């Protein structure tokens, strides 16, 4: 049940001022980061940024410390995004 552990947060609730070189330090200060993808969205939904990191063990720290944090002007919420290692039925 390993698929089970992601080491992906899924950061909801973002703002185009909420800069990704913030967003990445605040994580950096939890743990090791392996890739990070602040999603810039085109057509006016709410914007989310992908963090994975390098060690699962840490990213746990990461969640409860950003999770419903307030950035800028907005409550963020970090979320368990599953990282699959393979088989991806999602047509995404």
Not at 10 to 16: A, F, P
Not at 25 to 44: E, R, V, Y
Not at 60 to 71: D, F, T, V
Request: include cysteine; proline fraction near 4%.
């Amino acid at each position: 049940m390993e698929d089970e552990m992601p080491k992906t947060l899924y950061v909801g609730n973002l703002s185009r001022d909420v800069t990704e070189a913030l967003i990445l330090q605040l994580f950096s200060q939890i743990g090791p980061c392996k890739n990070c993808k602040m999603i810039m969205d085109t057509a006016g939904n709410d914007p989310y940024c992908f963090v994975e990191f390098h060690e699962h063990r840490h990213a746990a720290a990461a969640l409860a410390a950003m999770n419903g944090r307030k950035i800028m002007g907005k409550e963020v919420k970090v979320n368990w995004a599953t990282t699959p290692s393979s088989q991806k039925k999602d047509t995404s």
